[PDB]
Design a protein around this ligand. Structure first.
Ligand SMILES: C[C@@H]1O[C@@H](O[C@H]2[C@H](O[C@H]3[C@H](O)[C@@H](O)[C@H](O)O[C@@H]3CO)O[C@H](CO)[C@H](O)[C@@H]2O)[C@@H](O)[C@H](O)[C@@H]1O
Ligand SMILES: C[C@@H]1O[C@@H](O[C@@H]2[C@@H](O)[C@@H](O)[C@@H](CO)O[C@H]2O)[C@@H](O)[C@H](O)[C@@H]1O
Ligand SMILES: C[C@@H]1O[C@@H](O[C@@H]2[C@@H](O)[C@@H](O)[C@@H](CO)O[C@H]2O)[C@@H](O)[C@H](O)[C@@H]1O
Ligand SMILES: C[C@@H]1O[C@@H](O[C@@H]2[C@@H](O)[C@@H](O)[C@@H](CO)O[C@H]2O)[C@@H](O)[C@H](O)[C@@H]1O
Ligand SMILES: *[C@@H]1O[C@H](CO)[C@@H](O)[C@H](O)[C@H]1NC(C)=O
Ligand SMILES: *[C@@H]1O[C@H](CO)[C@@H](O)[C@H](O)[C@H]1NC(C)=O
Ligand SMILES: *[C@@H]1O[C@H](CO)[C@@H](O)[C@H](O)[C@H]1NC(C)=O
Ligand SMILES: *[C@@H]1O[C@H](CO)[C@@H](O)[C@H](O)[C@H]1NC(C)=O
Ligand SMILES: [Ca+2]
Ligand SMILES: [Ca+2]
Ligand SMILES: [Ca+2]
Ligand SMILES: [Ca+2]
Ligand SMILES: [Mn+2]
Ligand SMILES: [Mn+2]
Ligand SMILES: [Mn+2]
Ligand SMILES: [Mn+2]
Lengths: 236, 236, 234, 236
C-alpha cells in the first residue's frame, strides 16, 4: 500500500507517538491543546509532531510524495475575538522551536523574513491580523499557505466561527504540485477553500516532520487551539 | 479496514467493473467520456456506475456509512460555452436511466418535481442555466447538491475553466450529516467549495449504486464531460 | 492506493454486492452458508458482485492479492462431505452444467481442460476412492488449477465445528500462492505454497468468491464463511 | 481507518524513520542488514525499530490492538551452516539493547531467565541450537514464539533454505489472542507455520516499539540476516 498512513480519533494524555514542544499537551478529555488553556490565561506557544519522520521526496529516484490529511479543530475565544492562530506544517525532521519565536509566528519562524533555510511549509488559520504587530497579514481572519515565511504566498478570508468545530481536508497532489485546503463548519454549512502551487522538492529536505503549532500572543485576548482528531497519509 | 475502497488511475476500454448506461464509454486514451464525443456532434445522455452496490446504511444496527470520493474531470467546450453538465450520484442499487430523461436532468430524473420516490442524491456541475429550458437553475454556472430533485437544495457559483482539469473531493461525515464538495483547478488555483446537511438514511435505500452521469442537450453547444480518475471509499 | 479492497465483518440477508448461485445464501445470524443447511444434497457459490482485473494485456502487469476469511465446517456425525473452496473464475461465471458436489460447482468434469480457467483453493473433506479417485488419502487443502485434481495438497487437520482463520496471499513477482490456515481454538495450523502464473491461466477480468457442496445428504456438514477481507493491486 | 499502517518496499541508507541499534544498518542496495556483513567477518548484534511507538492496548477502554506484519528476509551462510538467527519483536517503547546481551539472545535478553519485567514478545528464526551454548533451544533450526524469555513457549522445525528469500506473514487477532506465523519460500514451495495464544495486555506495556533484531555469535560460522521489505499495520 502507501508509504504511511495513521489515524487518531482521539488523543490520550502523554501519547508516546506525538512529540510535544512548548506548551502543547493533551487534556484528559482526549483533545490536543496545542496552546495552553489554564486557570489564569497566559501567553503561550506550542507544537505537536508525529514521532516519526516522513520521506517527502527521494533524491535517488526523483519521486515526490503526495499526501492528504484531515483534522477537526476548535478555536474558542472568551471575548468575541482571540489570538493568534493554529497551523499545520511540514518542517525538517525532528525540528525544534526556533529561538525567539513569536506567537504570531506560530513557533515556526525566528523572524519575519523569507529565508530559504527555514524549510517550512505550513497552512495557517490566522485569527489575529493587527497592523501594529502583524504587518504582513491581510485585513481579516484568514487561511494562508506559508512557504519559508510568515507572509503567506496566498490567503483567503476565513469565516471563523467561535467555539464551533471545523473540518479540514488538505491534499497535495505531487504531479500537479497542487496544495488544496478544504475547510467547513458542519454547524451552519460555512465553507472556505484555497489552492496554491508548491514544489516540495524545492523547499523541503528529503525527510520531514509533520504536525500542528499555534500561539497566544496576548493573554488578554485568549482563545483555544484544540485539535480533536487527525488523519494523515503520504505516498512516494 | 473499511467496508469498501477502490481506485481507478485510468480507465480501460470496456472496463468490466463499470456499468455503462446511455452513451457513456471509455476512449482508447483511458478516459471515461460519460457524454459521447464525435466528429459530427450529437445530443447525448450517459451514466457510468461501479458494478457492485454499496451498503450506505444498515436497518439492523441503524449505522449510516461515511464516504469520501475523489476524481478529476474536464469539460471542454468548442465555443466559449457548453451544455449541460456532469454529476456524481448515489441512486438505488443497479438503477437504470429514467424514461424520458432530459440532458438538463443529467439522466437522473423523469421530471422536474421533488418526488420522494426518486431516491437520488447527486452533486451536479451544471454548465447550462438558461431560464427558457432550465427554470430551476440559478443565474450562473454552478455546483449543486441535489436531493430527489433537479432543483438543488444549495448551490454555489462554479468558476468553470474551459478545457482545464478540475480536482474534486467529496466527503460525507455520517455523524454530522455533513456533505462537503471541494473543487479546485491546479492550473490557476481557482477553488470552489460547498457544504450541506443531508441525511442519507432518510433519502436513500439500504443498498445504493454510485457513479457519474451527464448530458448534452443541444448538439450546437457541445462540450465534453470526461472523468480522468476516480477514488472512492465508504465505511459503516 | 490499491486497485481494490473490501471487507465484510458479517453478512446481511440478501447482501446486494454478493451474487448468489445455487443454494448459497446468508442466514439471519449474518453468516454466509455457501451450502444449504436444513436436509439435502446441495451446491452453492457466492461471488463478489464486481469483476476484478487480475492482469493487464496493455502493460503486462499481473495483480498481487491477499484475502482473509474465517469459516466453520460442522458435521452431524464425525465426518462430512464435501468441502469448501475459494476461487477465481472468468468474470460473472455461472455454475457449470452437470457439476458434482465433489467438484464444488466449479467443474463440468474431472479433466484438466485449459478452457476451464479456474484457480481455486479447496478445503476437501471427502476423499473416498469410489467417487473422488483424484483426491489423496486424507482431508486436505489443495491448490486447483483448471482441474479438480489439485496440483499440490497438504493434510488438513480439520476440527469439527471449530472456526478456522485463513489467509491467502499471491505475490505476483514470484508467482507464489500461499495458504495459511489456523484454528485459534487449539493452535492447529496448516500451510501450503505453490507456483501459479495467473496470466497463463485466467482471463484479464475475473470474479472471486466461495463455492462448496454436499454430495450425500446422509453425511451432512455446513460450509459457513463468517467474514471476508480481500484486496488486489496491479 | 486503522490506527497505523506503514510499508517499506526497500530501505534507504540512513532511513530516518528507523532507529538503528548495534551493528544494524541498510546497505546501498537498499537492504536492512540487521547483522553486520563485512570482510573479514566479525561477531555482531543489531536491532532496527520503527521510529514511532505504537499503542498496543488501552488502559482507559481495555481495548487490545490486532496487528499484522509482512516481511521478506534472507539468511545466507558461507558454509552449510550459520548462526545465530533473526527475530521480529515488540518491546517497551524506545527500548535499548540490554546490557551484556548474547547473539544467541538476539540482543533482546540480559539473561536466560523468564523475568516478567523483560516485557518482550518476539518471533525468532533460530539457526543455532547447540546444547553447549544454547541449552534452551530444541534439536533443530526453528521458528519460535518468545514471551519474556529466550526459551520459546512453542517452536516448530524451520526448513531453512540457504540464501533463499523467505516470505513471512505474522497476524495477531486480539479477540482470540491468536498469534500466527506464516513462512514460505517461493523458490521451492517450502512452508512452515506456527500458532500460539498470547495475551499482549498481560505481557506488554501500553506503548511498544516494533522491529527486528539478530546476531552472529561466532564469526567463523557467519551468515547474513537481511530483511528486504516490511509491511505493518495495527488497530485498536
Ligand atoms: C556463552 C554463549 O555465547 C554465545 O554462544 C555462541 C557461541 O559463542 C561462544 C564461541 O563459540 C566461543 O568461541 C567463545 O569462546 O565463547 C562464546 C560464548 O562465550 O558460538 C556459537 C558458534 O560456534 C554460537 O554463535 C553460539 O550462539 C551465546 O549465543 C549464548 O547465548 C551464550 O551466551
Ligand atoms: C512583538 C510581537 O509580539 C506578538 O504580537 C502579539 C499579537 O500576535 C497579538 O497577540 C496581540 C494582541 O493584542 O499582542 C501582540 O503582542 C507576536 O505575535 C508578534 O509576532 C511580535 O513578536
Ligand atoms: C425542454 C428542455 O429541453 C432541454 O433543455 C436544453 C438545455 O438543457 C440546453 O441543452 C439548451 C442549449 O441551448 O437546449 C435546451 O433544449 C432539457 O435539458 C430541459 O430539461 C428541458 O426538458
Ligand atoms: C452420485 C455421486 O454424487 C456425489 O458423490 C458423493 C460424494 O461426494 C460423497 O458425498 C459420498 C459420500 O458417501 O456420496 C456421493 O454421493 C458426486 O460428487 C459424484 O460425482 C457423483 O455424482
Ligand atoms: C532563529 O532560529 C535559528 C535557530 O537555529 C537561529 O540560528 C537564529 O539565530 C534565530 N534567530 C535569532 C534572531 O537569533
Ligand atoms: C420517470 O422515471 C421512472 C423510472 O423508473 C418511471 O417510473 C416514471 O414512469 C417516469 N416518468 C414517466 C412520465 O414515465
Ligand atoms: C461443462 O460446462 C460447460 C458450461 O459452459 C459446457 O460447455 C459443457 O457442455 C459442460 N459439460 C457437459 C458434459 O455438458
Ligand atoms: C540486563 O539488562 C538490563 C539493562 O537495563 C540491566 O538492568 C540488567 O542489569 C542486565 N543484566 C545484567 C546481568 O547486568
Ligand atoms: Ca497573525
Ligand atoms: Ca442545468
Ligand atoms: Ca473431494
Ligand atoms: Ca539459538
Ligand atoms: Mn497570516
Ligand atoms: Mn442546477
Ligand atoms: Mn481434493
Ligand atoms: Mn530458540
Amino acid at each position: 500500500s502507501d508509504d504511511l498512513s495513521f489515524n487518531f480519533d482521539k488523543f490520550v494524555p502523554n501519547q508516546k507517538n506525538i512529540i510535544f514542544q512548548g506548551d502543547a499537551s493533551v487534556s484528559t478529555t482526549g483533545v490536543l491543546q496545542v496552546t495552553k488553556v489554564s486557570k489564569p490565561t497566559t501567553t503561550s506557544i506550542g507544537r505537536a509532531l508525529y514521532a516519526a519522520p516522513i520521506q517527502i521526496w527521494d533524491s535517488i529516484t526523483g519521486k515526490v510524495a503526495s499526501f492528504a490529511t484531515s483534522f477537526s479543530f476548535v478555536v474558542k475565544a472568551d471575548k468575541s475575538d482571540g489570538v493568534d492562530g493554529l497551523a499545520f506544517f511540514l518542517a525538517p525532521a525532528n525540528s525544534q522551536i526556533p529561538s525567539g519565536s513569536s506567537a504570531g509566528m506560530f513557533g515556526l519562524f525566528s523572524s519575519s523574513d523569507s529565508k530559504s533555510s527555514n524549510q517550512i511549509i505550513a497552512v495557517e488559520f490566522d485569527t489575529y491580523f493587527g497592523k501594529a504587530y502583524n504587518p504582513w497579514d491581510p485585513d481579516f481572519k484568514h487561511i494562508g499557505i506559508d512557504v519559508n515565511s510568515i507572509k503567506s504566498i496566498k490567503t483567503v478570508k476565513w469565516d471563523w466561527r467561535n467555539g464551533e468545530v471545523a473540518d479540514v481536508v488538505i491534499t497535495y497532489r505531487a504531479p500537479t504540485k497542487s496544495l488544496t485546503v478544504c475547510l467547513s463548519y458542519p454547524s451552519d454549512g460555512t465553507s472556505n477553500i484555497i489552492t496554491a502551487s508548491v514544489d516540495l522538492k524545492a523547499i523541503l529536505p528529503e525527510w520531514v516532520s509533520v504536525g500542528f503549532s499555534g500561539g497566544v500572543g496576548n493573554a488578554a485576548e485568549f482563545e483555544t487551539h484544540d485539535v480533536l482528531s487527525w488523519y494523515f497519509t503520504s505516498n512516494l
